[PDB]
Design a protein around this ligand. Sequence first.
Ligand code: NA
Length: 127
Amino acid sequence: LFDEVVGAFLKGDAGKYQAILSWVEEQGGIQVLLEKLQSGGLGAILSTWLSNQQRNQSVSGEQLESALGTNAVSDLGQKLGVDTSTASSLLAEQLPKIIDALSPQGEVQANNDLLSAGMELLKGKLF
Ligand code: NA
């Protein structure tokens, strides 16, 4: 336990982005998550993230755990070594920024290989 606790203290939130990326793909891709947000009543909030004119509407960790499901969120928590609530809070901060970044044309290739879609977007800013 000692080395486990010391490691977690020293690491902080390092590697959160790799974890989220891997988790998105393990859950079946960004499109699965989009559909869950939509079926879970967060379609209007999601529409503000997709828009290329509007500011992202805030969402709570609880709202995301509700829409995405406890198992899905716990899957990310497990990858990070943290509890489900900490994982939902991480997603509440980062997921809107991720979805916004993936939709410069107002919709979200992101679904087939996320890292590849991300690399194209990064390179677009360098082009
Ligand atoms: Na789980």
